Design a protein around this ligand. Sequence first.
Ligand SMILES: Nc1ncnc2c1ncn2[C@@H]1O[C@H](CSCC[C@H](N)C(=O)O)[C@@H](O)[C@H]1O
Length: 241
Amino acid sequence: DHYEEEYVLGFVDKWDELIDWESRAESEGDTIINILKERGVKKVLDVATGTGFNSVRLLQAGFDVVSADGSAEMLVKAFDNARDHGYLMRTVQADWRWMNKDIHDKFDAIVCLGNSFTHLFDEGDRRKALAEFYALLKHDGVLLLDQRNYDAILDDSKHAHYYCGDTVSVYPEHVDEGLARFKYEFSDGSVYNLNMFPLRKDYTRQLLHEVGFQEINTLGDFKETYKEDEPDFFLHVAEKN
Ligand SMILES: Nc1ncnc2c1ncn2[C@@H]1O[C@H](CSCC[C@H](N)C(=O)O)[C@@H](O)[C@H]1O
């Protein structure tokens, strides 16, 4: 699918055109950075680099970072965004399903953020991806993996979620247990529609346990502009031991 990659490349361009990273950094806060700091983390592998926000935040924070993504095109955008923030990014093109094909080091932590794991629609692929991440971690390593709160949608909810003030709204057009389609509308009128797999919180936790992770703490993460009783995101902190 040539067009589908081009469609998503258009989407991330729009996201970064209209949402500046300083605002996003202020909002995210330093919870993730603090979690890594408290564990004495030095080497981090970003497996979902995208246009590089998480990686650049981590480089800025002083971590040694390897930035991987399945998409060469994303990595080019990430390297240039890093360059613009004054950092040399270490990029590696790699598919989650065979990560150690081109990555030969072990890491203190792996981050898989921005609701990325949701892009896998096959359960075999999910297991493989997690086993690949698990193998890339040092004995005392940690996996940080987030996701949208799909439970809230599946059990109720049919309204838009806004991010960075009203810069973008995210509306669930169709959600069932095998597929969520979101409409993203930006403040300039741009609309993009994206498919993803609606991971239940406990299903993700179960997968992490099943491939070998010893302890998993799931945190509620309220990112949206207009807060509800339920978090719109979950962050899983999975310790290899
Ligand atoms: N199977 C796979 N293997 C490697 N990378 C994958 C993948 N499936 C999706 N990705 C990547 O995961 C990314 C999701 S975008 C996440 C961007 C970043 N984490 C942020 O929060 O801004 C995309 O760049 C996509 O190329």
